[PDB]
Design a protein around this ligand. Structure first.
Ligand SMILES: *[C@@H]1O[C@H](CO)[C@@H](O[C@@H]2O[C@H](CO)[C@@H](O)[C@H](O)[C@H]2NC(C)=O)[C@H](O)[C@H]1NC(C)=O
Ligand code: NAG
Lengths: 177, 56
């Protein structure tokens, strides 16, 4: 994908996160578990919902054939009528098909972007209090219990509060144990 | 349909308060019944071989 997240550096998705499109999996002393990100999933639903509505709305006026009859010596205008009417069915079919194809790509790329951005949200909260492992996961340099996890999930992680514990752990790791 | 003669029909929309005056000397096929246009609206002449489906 254009944003390299879905079926990219995050290889494959989670059958087990059922309550949203994007979210988190965590793992600590008290266990592990999945949790949807409500806010991103909601922005996405808003986007896609609006998109589907805009498509319906723009296709609202659009050519509507009407039947006209012509006698056997009005063949030139019967042909001009057929071609005019076929001409519009063709313009409109192209418009619908191409809009659908073009917007499908954008939609699929929109979600990809949404996962990248969420990953980056967590990345820039944690900074060097966690280590980027490369598969979509962060490994903390400090103990992070369920309360601390939620703080990551909801925008509230206090970096200063853990950084001391973080610097001690990074220290132990560089030194070799 | 067994006939070599021909019949050629004509028509007009006769506005309210106006009259139509015929005069003839032969070969006239005269009106007996005519049609008041009681209501106007959206419709169409569909071309279909199908029949009434008792549905809506
Ligand atoms: C058809 O009949 C009516 C009368 O029943 C005629 O109505 C008169 O027409 C004149 C001219 O059009 C009007 O100005 C008057 O209002 C009507 N006069 C009267 C005395 O009612 C009408 O003219 C007739 N139409 C034709 C074409 O002869
Ligand atoms: C975010 O997470 C913490 C849990 O550590 C919680 O106490 C806080 O109230 C949450 N804030 C909001 C706005 O939900």
């Amino acid at each position: 994908g254009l944003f390299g997240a879905i079926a990219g550096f995050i290889e494959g998705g989670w059958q087990g996160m059922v309550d949203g499109w994007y979210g988190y999996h965590h793992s600590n002393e008290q266990g592990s578990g999945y949790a949807a990100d409500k806010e991103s999933t909601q922005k996405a639903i808003d986007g896609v919902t609006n998109k589907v509505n805009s498509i319906i709305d723009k296709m609202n006026t659009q050519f509507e054939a009407v039947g006209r009859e012509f006698n056997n010596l009005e063949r030139r205008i019967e042909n001009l009528n057929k071609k005019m009417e076929d001409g519009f069915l063709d313009v409109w079919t192209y418009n619908a098909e191409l809009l659908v194809l073009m917007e499908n790509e954008r939609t699929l790329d929109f979600h990809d972007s949404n996962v990248k951005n969420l990953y980056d949200k967590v990345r820039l909260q944690l900074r060097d209090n966690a280590k980027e492992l490369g598969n979509g996961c962060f490994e903390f340099y400090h103990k992070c219990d369920n309360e601390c996890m939620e703080s990551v999930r909801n925008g509230t992680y206090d970096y200063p509060q853990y950084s001391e514990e973080a610097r001690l752990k990074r220290e132990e790791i560089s030194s070799g144990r | 349909n067994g006939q070599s003669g021909r019949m050629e029909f004509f028509w007009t929309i006769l506005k309210p308060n106006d009259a139509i005056n015929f005069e003839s000397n032969g070969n006239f096929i005269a009106p007996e019944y005519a049609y008041k246009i009681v209501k106007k609206g959206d419709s169409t002449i569909m071309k279909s071989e199908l029949e009434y489906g008792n549905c809506n």
